[PDB]
Amino acid sequence: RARNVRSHTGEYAPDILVVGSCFLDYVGYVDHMPQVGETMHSVSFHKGFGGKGANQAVAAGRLGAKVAMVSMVGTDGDGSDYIKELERNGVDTAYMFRTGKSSTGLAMILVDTKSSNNEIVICPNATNHFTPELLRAQTNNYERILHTGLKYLICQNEIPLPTTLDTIKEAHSRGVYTVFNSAPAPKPAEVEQIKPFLPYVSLFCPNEVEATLITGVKVTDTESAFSAIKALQQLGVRDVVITLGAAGFVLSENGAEPVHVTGKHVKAVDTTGAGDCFVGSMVYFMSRGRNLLEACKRANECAAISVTRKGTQLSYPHPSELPAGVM
Amino acid sequence: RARNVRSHTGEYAPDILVVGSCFLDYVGYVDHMPQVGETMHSVSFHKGFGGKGANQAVAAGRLGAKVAMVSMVGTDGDGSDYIKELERNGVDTAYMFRTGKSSTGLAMILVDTKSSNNEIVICPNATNHFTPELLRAQTNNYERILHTGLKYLICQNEIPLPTTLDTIKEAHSRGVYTVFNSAPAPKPAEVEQIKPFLPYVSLFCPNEVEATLITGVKVTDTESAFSAIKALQQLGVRDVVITLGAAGFVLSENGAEPVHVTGKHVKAVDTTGAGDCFVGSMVYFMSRGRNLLEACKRANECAAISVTRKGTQLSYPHPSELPAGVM
Numbered sequence: 001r002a003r004n005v006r007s008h009t010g011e012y013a014p015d016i017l018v019v020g021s022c023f024l025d026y027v028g029y030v031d032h033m034p035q036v037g038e039t040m041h042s043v044s045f046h047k048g049f050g051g052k053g054a055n056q057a058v059a060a061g062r063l064g065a066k067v068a069m070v071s072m073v074g075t076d077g078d079g080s081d082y083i084k085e086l087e088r089n090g091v092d093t094a095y096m097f098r099t100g101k102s103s104t105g106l107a108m109i110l111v112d113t114k115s116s117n118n119e120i121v122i123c124p125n126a127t128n129h130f131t132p133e134l135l136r137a138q139t140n141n142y143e144r145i146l147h148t149g150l151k152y153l154i155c156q157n158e159i160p161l162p163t164t165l166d167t168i169k170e171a172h173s174r175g176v177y178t179v180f181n182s183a184p185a186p187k188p189a190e191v192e193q194i195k196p197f198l199p200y201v202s203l204f205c206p207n208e209v210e211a212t213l214i215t216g217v218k219v220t221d222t223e224s225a226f227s228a229i230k231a232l233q234q235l236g237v238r239d240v241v242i243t244l245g246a247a248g249f250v251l252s253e254n255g256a257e258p259v260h261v262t263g264k265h266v267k268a269v270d271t272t273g274a275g276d277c278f279v280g281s282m283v284y285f286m287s288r289g290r291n292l293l294e295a296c297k298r299a300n301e302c303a304a305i306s307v308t309r310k311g312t313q314l315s316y317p318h319p320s321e322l323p324a325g326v327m
Numbered sequence: 328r329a330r331n332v333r334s335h336t337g338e339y340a341p342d343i344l345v346v347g348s349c350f351l352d353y354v355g356y357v358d359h360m361p362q363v364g365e366t367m368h369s370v371s372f373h374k375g376f377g378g379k380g381a382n383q384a385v386a387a388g389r390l391g392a393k394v395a396m397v398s399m400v401g402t403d404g405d406g407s408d409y410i411k412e413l414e415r416n417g418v419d420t421a422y423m424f425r426t427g428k429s430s431t432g433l434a435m436i437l438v439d440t441k442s443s444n445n446e447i448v449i450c451p452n453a454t455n456h457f458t459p460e461l462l463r464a465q466t467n468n469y470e471r472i473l474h475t476g477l478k479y480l481i482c483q484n485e486i487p488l489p490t491t492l493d494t495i496k497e498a499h500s501r502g503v504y505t506v507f508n509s510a511p512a513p514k515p516a517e518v519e520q521i522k523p524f525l526p527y528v529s530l531f532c533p534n535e536v537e538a539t540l541i542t543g544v545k546v547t548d549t550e551s552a553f554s555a556i557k558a559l560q561q562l563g564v565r566d567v568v569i570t571l572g573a574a575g576f577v578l579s580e581n582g583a584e585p586v587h588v589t590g591k592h593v594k595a596v597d598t599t600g601a602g603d604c605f606v607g608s609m610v611y612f613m614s615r616g617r618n619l620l621e622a623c624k625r626a627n628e629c630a631a632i633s634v635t636r637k638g639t640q641l642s643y644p645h646p647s648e649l650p651a652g653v654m
């Protein structure tokens with residue numbers, strides 16, 4: 001067993017539960033994109049650890065969060081590699097599920113560095129079988145994972161939508177603070193299914209595109225982001241944070257006056273996974289007792305550090321890197 | 328340790344040594360090939376065990392060969408998965424080397440089922456480090472792997488060429504019968520370096536193209552293939568077999584008048600790995616005491632059977648599956 005073991009008494013029970021995706025990123029660097037029928041060699045290769053779920057857990061875990069990852073991977077070696085990687089990044093793996101019927105989720109990514117273009121094929125694999133019915137069967141109808149000590153749930157939109165929504169509803173009904181980062185961007189039928197669940201979302205944390213799709217407000221800037229916040233509060237979301245990339249974020253804590261905080265001025269080298277870093281960091285700071293605004297300002301700083309380096313999870317900061325007063 | 332362990336008395340020493348490649352095949356089935364800049368989902372995914380080296384070892388191992396694989400994989404989970412898969416296919420893994428600095432080699436393979444077209448990006452990864460100097464360092468300058476009592480060596484052209492050539496030469500100098508399958512097809516510079524080592528090749532077993540590029544003799548059919556055979560005897564090769572797909576093979580034993588055996592008439596569903604199956608089967612049968620022609624006749628039948636099912640290694644027959652009169 002590479003995975004952690006939970007104890008009878010729950011001594012190591014997490015503060016933060018992430019229920020979402022774990023994908024290996026298989027990155028082949030190529031001199032040109034392959035044409036149909038072409039067999040070629042890569043010029044370089046890189047194996048990365050991704051999935052928005054795992055990214056957010058690892059962002060939190062690297063800062064010292066008592067975070068646990070709930071997901072499905074294979075019994076394959078890729079699954080074991082992920083489980084170990086999570087542990088080494090401070091993420092509890094007791095509630096990682098392993099299937100013999102599917103490979104670990106992964107993305108096959110081709111990168112032309114000369115032209116800086118990508119081609120990506122997402123292979124959710126085991127993730128597609130991470131259903132509410134399976135989750136319930138394996139957790140005694142969520143009792144195993146939603147213990148009374150649990151303060152935060154983080155979900156994304158990278159696992160079957162019913163799993164995300166049912167987990168949010170059940171956690172919220174137990175008084176867990178639910179965080180929903182609706183990434184990747186919901187499709188029109190996903191938006192329709194999400195909206196009735198928004199009352200069970202303590203904190204809705206979309207980017208501009210996602211806020212656009214959910215609310216019907218065209219979000220492009222601070223003022224339109226503030227309108228989006230309003231629509232989201234009307235749909236029953238308590239706390240709203242909308243990230244705006246280089247423009248930072250906007251938020252409203254529980255209907256209060258919305259606030260804008262601009263992006264840090266940094267040399268953006270690679271923003272891949274910056275959003276996940278923001279979300280994971282944000283929730284860690286809330287588990288340390290920061291209020292939403294304090295938490296997002298610090299997340300905004302963490303995500304800004306991440307933007308200055310390549311490597312997605314490899315760019316997420318450790319506490320030593322943060323300015324005084326952030327931790 | 329997933330890998331096999333040798334005895335002090337050589338009681339498990341193999342009859343057949345395969346020095347070549349192990350690649351995981353990451354097969355993403357797609358609605359269409361991705362365009363430049365596109366992110367898409369697969370429709371399904373399949374994890375397979377490939378590399379021509381492993382493929383040939385597994386073809387032999389499935390028929391009961393006392394075969395051992397010599398290769399380099401990672402310390403990663405893919406590496407560990409390959410090591411176990413080899414064992415489950417009757418291949419000894421005591422001389423599988425592992426490096427913590429490189430992922431296991433892999434091919435990222437996209438398949439459009441509609442069009443049956445493929446795009447393939449090969450990432451040799453660990454394989455690039457499988458050098459003659461490493462091989463020597465790990466094997467007491469080949470003494471650990473080229474025991475007296477080793478009967479056959481199989482090499483391909485999917486590891487660093489010098490490792491292939493040096494191994495063939497060392498094995499031949501010890502009275503091992505050396506089989507060289509020059510796949511994938513050697514490039515002009517590879518041909519130049521191969522040619523002086525052909526006197527150490529007991530059996531050269533290319534397909535049509537590969538015979539073409541080595542002799543200069545264009546091969547399309549039987550008449551030309553016989554020309555190419557003479558050309559390869561001229562270059563110093565004792566025995567010569569050329570596979571011809573659905574047209575079976577041609578061969579000459581130690582300078583005898585060539586023979587054409589035609590292909591078996593079967594419903595070709597998927598010919599991936601058929602050549603690997605032929606080579607490994609051929610060697611197994613020679614190891615059982617059949618002569619080149621009887622070996623090749625049976626290898627021809629095995630490869631024909633493989634072509635009737637998808638799955639590469641999974642399409643390679645086990646003895647219980649063969650029609651009577653093949654084993």
Ligand SMILES: Nc1ncnc2c1ncn2[C@@H]1O[C@H](COP(=O)(O)OP(=O)(O)OP(=O)(O)O)[C@@H](O)[C@H]1O
Binds near residue numbers: 246248274275276
């Ligand atoms: N160019 C940048 N400069 C400074 N900070 C940035 C930049 N890009 C992103 N950030 C930081 O990352 C956070 C998230 O960025 P963004 O809204 O782009 O996330 P996303 O759309 O969810 O995905 P990603 O940022 O990973 O592409 C921002 O709120 C900000 O803190």
Ligand SMILES: Nc1ncnc2c1ncn2[C@@H]1O[C@H](COP(=O)(O)OP(=O)(O)OP(=O)(O)O)[C@@H](O)[C@H]1O
Binds near residue numbers: 534570575591602
């Ligand atoms: N359509 C077919 N029908 C019958 N036998 C086949 C067919 N295709 C391949 N074979 C068998 O497989 C052997 C190898 O075929 P081939 O020469 O195509 O090998 P290769 O170029 O090394 O690669 P591959 O066979 O894997 O495409 C043939 O000699 C024959 O035994």
Ligand SMILES: [Cl-]
Binds near residue numbers: 083
């Ligand atoms: Cl485990």
Ligand SMILES: [Cl-]
Binds near residue numbers: 047049311312
């Ligand atoms: Cl990584």
Ligand SMILES: [Cl-]
Binds near residue numbers: 102103125372
């Ligand atoms: Cl799968």
Ligand SMILES: [Cl-]
Binds near residue numbers: 328329330410
């Ligand atoms: Cl091992």
Ligand SMILES: [Cl-]
Binds near residue numbers: 374640
């Ligand atoms: Cl396989």
Ligand SMILES: [Cl-]
Binds near residue numbers: 045429430452453
């Ligand atoms: Cl590598």
Ligand SMILES: [Cl-]
Binds near residue numbers: 640641642
């Ligand atoms: Cl099988």
Ligand code: NA
Binds near residue numbers: 061063064065090
């Ligand atoms: Na820690």
Ligand code: NA
Binds near residue numbers: 061064066067091092
């Ligand atoms: Na932790």
Ligand code: NA
Binds near residue numbers: 096097098099
């Ligand atoms: Na499990």
Ligand code: NA
Binds near residue numbers: 311315
């Ligand atoms: Na980054």
Ligand code: NA
Binds near residue numbers: 388389390391417
């Ligand atoms: Na056997």
Ligand code: NA
Binds near residue numbers: 391392417418
């Ligand atoms: Na065997």
Ligand code: NA
Binds near residue numbers: 634
């Ligand atoms: Na086949």
